[PDB]
């Protein structure tokens, strides 16, 4: 991992997903690391981002 961090651009960032309300810019829910979510939770996020 380290020898990726030190020489490759796209390994210097952690990615995260957030949910925002139309009527409010306040976070409704944001997820990264320790998903702790059912299998069905994953596949939605997957398909939508892709």
């Amino acid at each position: 991992l380290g020898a990726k961090a030190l020489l490759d651009p796209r390994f210097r960032l952690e990615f995260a997903v957030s949910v925002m309300d139309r009527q409010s810019g306040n976070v409704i829910e944001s997820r990264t690391g320790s998903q702790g979510g059912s299998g069905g939770e994953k596949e939605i996020i997957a398909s939508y981002v892709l």
């Binding site: 976070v27 829910e29 944001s30 690391g33 998903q35 702790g36 979510g37």
Partner: protein, 50 residues
């Protein structure tokens, strides 16, 4: 989660939520079940996720 609860009894080091990653890795600890941590809360100090 029900199956995870049962699995804590039969195993030396049961891998919780295994079927989420097709056999790759486990995501959840043991304590969060006791704490009833309903997913990862929002970063605005949260406390609504436990």
């Amino acid at each position: 989660t029900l199956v995870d609860a049962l699995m804590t009894l039969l195993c030396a080091n049961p891998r919780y939520n295994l079927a989420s990653t097709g056999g790759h890795e486990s995501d959840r600890d043991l304590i969060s079940y006791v704490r009833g941590v309903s997913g990862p809360g929002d970063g605005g100090e949260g406390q609504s996720h436990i």
